[PDB]
Amino acid sequence: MVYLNSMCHMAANSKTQQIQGDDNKDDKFPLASISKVVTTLWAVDRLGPDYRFKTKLHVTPTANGSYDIHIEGSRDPLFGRNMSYFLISELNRMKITKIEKLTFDENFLLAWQASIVRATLTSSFATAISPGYYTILKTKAARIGVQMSNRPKIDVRTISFVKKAEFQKNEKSTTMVLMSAPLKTILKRMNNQSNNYIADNLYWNLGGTEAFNAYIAGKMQADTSDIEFHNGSGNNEGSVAKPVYNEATCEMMIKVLYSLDKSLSAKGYDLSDVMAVAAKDKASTVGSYGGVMAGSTTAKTGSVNKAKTLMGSVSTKNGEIYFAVLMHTDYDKSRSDWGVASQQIKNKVSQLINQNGGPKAIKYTEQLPLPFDKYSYLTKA
Amino acid sequence: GKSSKALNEAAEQGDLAKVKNLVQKNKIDLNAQDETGMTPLMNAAMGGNLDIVKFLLSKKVNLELKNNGGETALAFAVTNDAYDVAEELIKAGANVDIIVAGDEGDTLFMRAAQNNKKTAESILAKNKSLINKANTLGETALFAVARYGTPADIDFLIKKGADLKLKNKKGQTALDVAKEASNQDTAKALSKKK
Numbered sequence: 001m002v003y004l005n006s007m008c009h010m011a012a013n014s015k016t017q018q019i020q021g022d023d024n025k026d027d028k029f030p031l032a033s034i035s036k037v038v039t040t041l042w043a044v045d046r047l048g049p050d051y052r053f054k055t056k057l058h059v060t061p062t063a064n065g066s067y068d069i070h071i072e073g074s075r076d077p078l079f080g081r082n083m084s085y086f087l088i089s090e091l092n093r094m095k096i097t098k099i100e101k102l103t104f105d106e107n108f109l110l111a112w113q114a115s116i117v118r119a120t121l122t123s124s125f126a127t128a129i130s131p132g133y134y135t136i137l138k139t140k141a142a143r144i145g146v147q148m149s150n151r152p153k154i155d156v157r158t159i160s161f162v163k164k165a166e167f168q169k170n171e172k173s174t175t176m177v178l179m180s181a182p183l184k185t186i187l188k189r190m191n192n193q194s195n196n197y198i199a200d201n202l203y204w205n206l207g208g209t210e211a212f213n214a215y216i217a218g219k220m221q222a223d224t225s226d227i228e229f230h231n232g233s234g235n236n237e238g239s240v241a242k243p244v245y246n247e248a249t250c251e252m253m254i255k256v257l258y259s260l261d262k263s264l265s266a267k268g269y270d271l272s273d274v275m276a277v278a279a280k281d282k283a284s285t286v287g288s289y290g291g292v293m294a295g296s297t298t299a300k301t302g303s304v305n306k307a308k309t310l311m312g313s314v315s316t317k318n319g320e321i322y323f324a325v326l327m328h329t330d331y332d333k334s335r336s337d338w339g340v341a342s343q344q345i346k347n348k349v350s351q352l353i354n355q356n357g358g359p360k361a362i363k364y365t366e367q368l369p370l371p372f373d374k375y376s377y378l379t380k381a
Numbered sequence: 382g383k384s385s386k387a388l389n390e391a392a393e394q395g396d397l398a399k400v401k402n403l404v405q406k407n408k409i410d411l412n413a414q415d416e417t418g419m420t421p422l423m424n425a426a427m428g429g430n431l432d433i434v435k436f437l438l439s440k441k442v443n444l445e446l447k448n449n450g451g452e453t454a455l456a457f458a459v460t461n462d463a464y465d466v467a468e469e470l471i472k473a474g475a476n477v478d479i480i481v482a483g484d485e486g487d488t489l490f491m492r493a494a495q496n497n498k499k500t501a502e503s504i505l506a507k508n509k510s511l512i513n514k515a516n517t518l519g520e521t522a523l524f525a526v527a528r529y530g531t532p533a534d535i536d537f538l539i540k541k542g543a544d545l546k547l548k549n550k551k552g553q554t555a556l557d558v559a560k561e562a563s564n565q566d567t568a569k570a571l572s573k574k575k
């Protein structure tokens with residue numbers, strides 16, 4: 001069954017900072033993947049929107065004109081196929097195609113623990129590259145002015161795990177850095193649409209639940225009656241019998257948006273630099289949002305068994321307004337509930353816009369959020 | 382045959398290989414519906430998983446089965462914003478003259494029209510009359526857009542043949558509902574259209 005748990009809003013430029021909405025705006029409800037926006041705030045506060053993950057390669061020539069390479073990982077939470085293909089392209093451009101020994105430490109997170117990363121490296125990294133995925137990437141890379149090799153290839157004899165604590169660079173080794181795109185791009189990719197991986201790895205990298213509870217307490221004077229998190233993504237930790245969802249109040253979601261916007265603003269950024277724009281970000285869950293929301297609304301969606309959710313900002317003739325809509329669903333019993341709830345949320349948000357003099361388009365051009373950019377080229381440290 | 386919980390979960394989550402493992406083994410009737418009336422195809426559609434949809438279509442599954450909310454795979458695709466999948470299903474011959482879940486009985490056309498113009502056009506190319514097919518409350522897409530849309534959405538609908546004079550079951554015009562919903566811009570536009 002579909003019904004509203006709580007909706008709330010607040011004008012961004014509100015002097016009084018009074019959060020308007022229903023009498024349930026102070027009750028905890030399941031958030032689903034709007035949790036990713038809270039994770040965004042934390043990452044933005046702890047690292048900065050321009051932060052970059054600096055993966056290091058320790059590169060030593062070997063007897064036969066080959067190289068040994070050790071990857072000192074940065075826990076970059078967006079190091080998958082795409083970033084791997086870029087790495088391979090970069091090794092080629094540096095004329096590294098013969099690798100005797102490839103080793104990696106525990107901070108080298110690779111999702112296409114040591115046992116599994118070794119397997120993905122052997123299975124995927126060192127194997128043949130997909131022309132399908134590669135050319136698509138290369139052509140995307142070109143759109144943001146990043147150069148990649150044609151038919152890059154790598155040959156790796158041996159792959160193995162070597163703990164950070166137990167690694168010593170040879171004195172004949174050269175240290176190279178492969179920087180991620182800035183965090184804001186990573187967060188944009190995450191918030192457009194993602195499985196749990198990026199969000200959950202950010203949340204863990206920042207210290208997990210203990211550190212989160214400490215952060216939100218300091219930041220917002222929030223206790224567990226306001227917000228209770230178990231992961232970064234909002235996905236169920238328990239079972240369909242015993243579900244465990246991140247929950248928080250609708251007011252807390254408004255405070256999160258307020259604080260996120262303030263921290264981004266201090267570096268010249270807007271919510272649209274880390275969250276999806278209705279009808280403009282086509283690779284996002286809001287790519288087909290129509291009506292008064294199209295071009296005016298920056299937002300994150302969520303869906304889980306018991307909830308359909310949306311939060312973000314609307315740009316109206318009366319100004320920027322933060323909003324959060326938390327709907328109840330019973331997707332277990334009626335899979336149709338998500339679609340029913342999704343349109344009711346849309347209509348509520350459209351009504352909020354109507355009541356504030358109608359929409360006003362934001363300044364935004366659709367971004368292409370790859371895990372690397374033009375500063376990600378392998379470079380000597 | 383029997384439905385598989387594992388196949389249905391795989392299809393929703395977007396795990397192509399697991400879907401292929403369970404299907405090709407052929408222990409599973411692909412048209413069998415589970416406890417809430419779901420098929421593998423409805424699961425794939427709902428999750429926006431185009432490759433799984435294509436795989437299932439190559440097995441010639443029935444497109445028109447309905448879950449307990451009365452929804453076909455195409456209604457799942459439209460209502461969950463999987464408009465890539467929706468276009469695939471429409472090209473594969475999925476019936477467009479269907480109702481999506483909820484009390485209003487909105488038509489598929491009306492839901493697409495509020496969100497994805499391309500798909501709304503693809504629906505009308507199959508059945509041009511849907512432009513004016515009313516839901517349970519006697520409301521067309523014009524009404525929904527009058528409430529929650531833009532003058533450009535209204536122009537879109539008029540270009541596809543929207544009747545301006547229709548009245549819902551309460552005796553309201555689309556202009557009436559625009560005003561009731563405080564949508565200044567659509568009320569303005571609707572007052573002026575001839």
Ligand SMILES: *C(=O)C(NC(=O)Cc1ccccc1)[C@@H]1N[C@@H](C(=O)O)C(C)(C)S1
Pocket residue numbers: 031032033034193194195233234235285300301302303304393394428
């Ligand atoms: C966050 O809400 C999401 N939810 C899930 O991953 C739960 C789930 C469980 C089974 C099958 C699909 C999803 C991700 N964000 C959703 C959203 O933005 O609405 C999503 C459905 C795109 S997945």
